[PDB]
């Protein structure tokens, strides 16, 4: 993105990451580094050592940090005393966190100077307009008896995997690929992501998978029509850009994190026509009711609404019923993933060696 | 040369006075260079590359 | 009885010193026999005779690891032929290196 | 070359000491590469 709108020849820019660790000779020149590589203290590499020494080495002039939210962590917090720098700028969407650090920002990188509203760059063409939704699955009557006795670690695993949520995305992916519209799924518990990818046959990303695999990944989807739906999870929870992608969908979460909720939904907002007429995003909530996921929905969608975003109450799908196929739907199959889910939980003697 | 006074090493074996044995130091420094180096590491710094006459 | 042992090997080394020998420079089996124990720090138990007996001898055990060697068992004898021979020729007892023989004069 | 130069001649050659020679697998076979746009 540097290298694309402003006139910074490559000579000058230097890329500091865990594939290469070479730093820029130039008299001046930029860094773009990650907390990981500036915060961390304890084990550096050898390679890594050098460039740490060499940021130290110099007097920087500007310190940009992308992602202001993560910084009043409890180490992160560290680099911007140790680092020296005569300005210091925050990039964030988000400027709203769990825990009461958020205000610490006034004396930690100064006073926030401007806010843009959302729905105002929506109706101005400059975002997509979303059609917000909340689908309410009911827990089916074998697993919910699990429920009541289950503790609640495993709780979670119980009512995220019900059959109801199998069909319900396996008919709206059905319905929105004859769409014409790129999906996104979002699901924070990989073994739900695996069991999902596997069972439909679609790729899924989560932390193992490497970065050249994912990057081929992500190329197809962009510009092969083949691959028209995708498995995200936390990795990609933010800052990765999908400029075809239209509808979102999500089925786990992490907790009542308000903040995850705008910034998986950031993934849809910079569609690529987001100014066609009559041009409305569709964004998925699939959550099991009578469950602790009220609470956690409830919660986690309180920051949306206040910026302006409604969320559509779906009780029934129409023609959910004619799809000609759905996962789970007897009883045998029902039983056999429950028990599936539930059992979740000397120098010349060196010869002889 | 296939070796020039870029090299600190070369530079203490043209230091030498008597002949006999300032070729010994250059030719066993340059027996083992099996390329003309078009282009050599800087002195101040091993950064950037300074031009040197050479051919690759 | 005076006193590990279970993984002892079964193949033992033994060495017998000529007592004139030992009496003709001032040797006693206690110091050579720690000389042999610090050549290899712990990787074999020895035994060494007192002065008293008739006849010396040094026994020597090569103690196996805890891992299981099947290929080894055809080279064992093999190896203790080695290092028996490297006990004989690298063994420094005592004295500097390139030192054949020493003769007293007045 | 050298010498038609010294005496005025421009050479049509230069001395040949100047030329320098200079985890997901389910969907193997499906992802087609599409390394550049
Ligand atoms: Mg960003
Ligand atoms: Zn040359």
């Given at each position: 993105?540097?290298?694309?709108?402003?006139?910074?020849?490559?000579?000058?820019?230097?890329?500091?990451?865990?594939?290469?660790?070479?730093?820029?000779?130039?008299?001046?020149?930029?860094?773009?580094?990650?907390?990981?590589?500036?915060?961390?203290?304890?084990?550096?590499?050898?390679?890594?050592?050098?460039?740490?020494?060499?940021?130290?080495?110099?007097?920087?002039?500007?310190?940009?940090?992308?992602?202001?939210?993560?910084?009043?962590?409890?180490?992160?917090?560290?680099?911007?005393?140790?680092?020296?720098?005569?300005?210091?700028?925050?990039?964030?969407?988000?400027?709203?966190?769990?825990?009461?650090?958020?205000?610490?920002?006034?004396?930690?990188?100064?006073?926030?100077?401007?806010?843009?509203?959302?729905?105002?760059?929506?109706?101005?063409?400059?975002?997509?307009?979303?059609?917000?939704?909340?689908?309410?699955?009911?827990?089916?009557?074998?697993?919910?008896?699990?429920?009541?006795?289950?503790?609640?670690?495993?709780?979670?695993?119980?009512?995220?995997?019900?059959?109801?949520?199998?069909?319900?995305?396996?008919?709206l992916i059905?319905?929105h690929e004859?769409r014409?519209d790129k999906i996104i799924v979002?699901?924070?518990?990989?073994?739900?992501?695996?069991?999902?990818?596997?069972?439909?046959?679609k790729?899924?990303?989560?932390?193992?998978?490497?970065?050249?695999?994912?990057?081929?990944?992500?190329?197809?989807?962009?510009?092969?029509?083949?691959?028209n739906t995708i498995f995200?999870?936390?990795?990609?929870?933010?800052?990765?850009?999908?400029?075809?992608a239209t509808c979102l969908i999500?089925?786990?979460?992490?907790?009542?994190?308000?903040?995850?909720?705008?910034?998986?939904?950031?993934?849809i907002?910079?569609?690529?026509?987001?100014?066609?007429?009559?041009?409305?995003?569709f964004?998925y909530?699939?959550?099991?009711?009578?469950?602790?996921?009220?609470?956690?929905?409830?919660?986690?969608?309180?920051?949306?609404?206040?910026?302006?975003?409604?969320?559509?109450?779906?009780?029934?799908?129409?023609?959910?019923?004619?799809?000609?196929?759905?996962?789970?739907?007897?009883?045998?199959?029902?039983?056999?993933?429950?028990?599936?889910?539930?059992?979740?939980?000397?120098?010349?003697?060196?010869?002889?060696? | 040369?296939?070796?020039?006074?870029?090299?600190?090493?070369?530079?203490?074996?043209?230091?030498?006075?008597?002949?006999?044995?300032?070729?010994?130091?250059?030719?066993?420094?340059?027996?083992?260079?099996?390329?003309?180096?078009?282009?050599?590491?800087?002195?101040?710094?091993?950064?950037?590359?300074?031009?040197?006459?050479?051919?690759? | 009885?005076?006193?590990?042992?279970?993984?002892?090997?079964?193949?033992?080394?033994?060495?017998?010193?000529?007592?004139?020998?030992?009496?003709?420079?001032?040797?006693?089996?206690?110091?050579?026999?720690?000389?042999?124990?610090?050549?290899?720090?712990?990787?074999?138990?020895?035994?060494?005779?007192?002065?008293?007996?008739?006849?010396?001898?040094?026994?020597?055990?090569?103690?196996?690891?805890?891992?299981?060697?099947?290929?080894?068992?055809?080279?064992?004898?093999?190896?203790?032929?080695?290092?028996?021979?490297?006990?004989?020729?690298?063994?420094?007892?005592?004295?500097?290196?390139?030192?054949?023989?020493?003769?007293?004069?007045? | 070359?050298?010498?038609?130069?010294?005496?005025?001649?421009?050479?049509?050659?230069?001395?040949?000491?100047?030329?320098?020679?200079?985890?997901?697998?389910?969907?193997?076979?499906?992802?087609?590469?599409?390394?550049?746009?």
């Amino acid at each position: 993105q540097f290298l694309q709108w402003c006139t910074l020849q490559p000579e000058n820019c230097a890329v500091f990451t865990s594939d290469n660790k070479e730093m820029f000779q130039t008299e001046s020149g930029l860094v773009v580094s990650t907390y990981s590589m500036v915060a961390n203290t304890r084990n550096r590499s050898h390679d890594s050592q050098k460039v740490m020494d060499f940021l130290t080495g110099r007097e920087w002039g500007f310190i940009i940090l992308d992602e202001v939210h993560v910084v009043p962590a409890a180490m992160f917090r560290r680099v911007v005393s140790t680092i020296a720098a005569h300005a210091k700028l925050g990039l964030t969407a988000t400027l709203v966190r769990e825990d009461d650090k958020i205000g610490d920002l006034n004396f930690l990188i100064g006073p926030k100077l401007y806010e843009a509203n959302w729905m105002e760059l929506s109706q101005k063409g400059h975002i997509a307009n979303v059609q917000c939704a909340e689908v309410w699955c009911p827990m089916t009557a074998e697993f919910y008896q699990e429920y009541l006795r289950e503790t609640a670690r495993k709780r979670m695993l119980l009512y995220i995997m019900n059959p109801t949520k199998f069909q319900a995305c396996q008919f709206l992916i059905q319905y929105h690929e004859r769409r014409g519209d790129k999906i996104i799924v979002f699901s924070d518990n990989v073994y739900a992501l695996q069991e999902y990818a596997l069972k439909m046959g679609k790729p899924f990303i989560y932390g193992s998978t490497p970065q050249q695999e994912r990057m081929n990944i992500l190329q197809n989807f962009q510009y092969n029509d083949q691959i028209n739906t995708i498995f995200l999870s936390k990795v990609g929870d933010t800052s990765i850009d999908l400029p075809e992608a239209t509808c979102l969908i999500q089925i786990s979460s992490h907790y009542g994190s308000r903040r995850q909720e705008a910034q998986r939904l950031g993934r849809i907002l910079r569609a690529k026509r987001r100014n066609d007429e009559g041009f409305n995003a569709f964004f998925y909530s699939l959550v099991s009711k009578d469950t602790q996921e009220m609470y956690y929905s409830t919660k986690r969608q309180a920051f949306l609404v206040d910026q302006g975003y409604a969320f559509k109450v779906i009780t029934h799908l129409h023609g959910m019923e004619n799809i000609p196929n759905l996962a789970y739907a007897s009883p045998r199959e029902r039983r056999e993933l429950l028990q599936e889910v539930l059992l979740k939980n000397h120098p010349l003697i060196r010869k002889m060696y | 040369l296939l070796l020039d006074e870029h090299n600190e090493l070369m530079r203490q074996a043209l230091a030498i006075k008597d002949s006999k044995k300032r070729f010994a130091a250059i030719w066993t420094l340059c027996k083992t260079k099996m390329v003309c180096e078009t282009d050599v590491p800087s002195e101040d710094d091993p950064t950037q590359l300074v031009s040197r006459g050479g051919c690759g | 009885s005076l006193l590990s042992f279970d993984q002892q090997s079964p193949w033992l080394l033994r060495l017998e010193l000529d007592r004139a020998a030992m009496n003709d420079k001032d040797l006693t089996m206690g110091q050579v026999g720690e000389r042999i124990k610090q050549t290899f720090k712990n990787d074999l138990f020895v035994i060494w005779s007192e002065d008293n007996d008739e006849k010396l001898i040094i026994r020597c055990r090569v103690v196996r690891p805890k891992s299981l060697d099947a290929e080894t068992e055809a080279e064992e004898d093999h190896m203790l032929k080695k290092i028996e021979n490297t006990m004989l020729e690298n063994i420094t007892l005592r004295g500097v290196e390139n030192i054949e023989r020493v003769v007293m004069m007045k | 070359p050298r010498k038609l130069q010294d005496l005025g001649l421009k050479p049509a050659s230069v001395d040949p000491a100047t030329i320098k020679r200079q985890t997901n697998t389910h969907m193997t076979g499906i992802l087609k590469d599409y390394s550049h746009r």
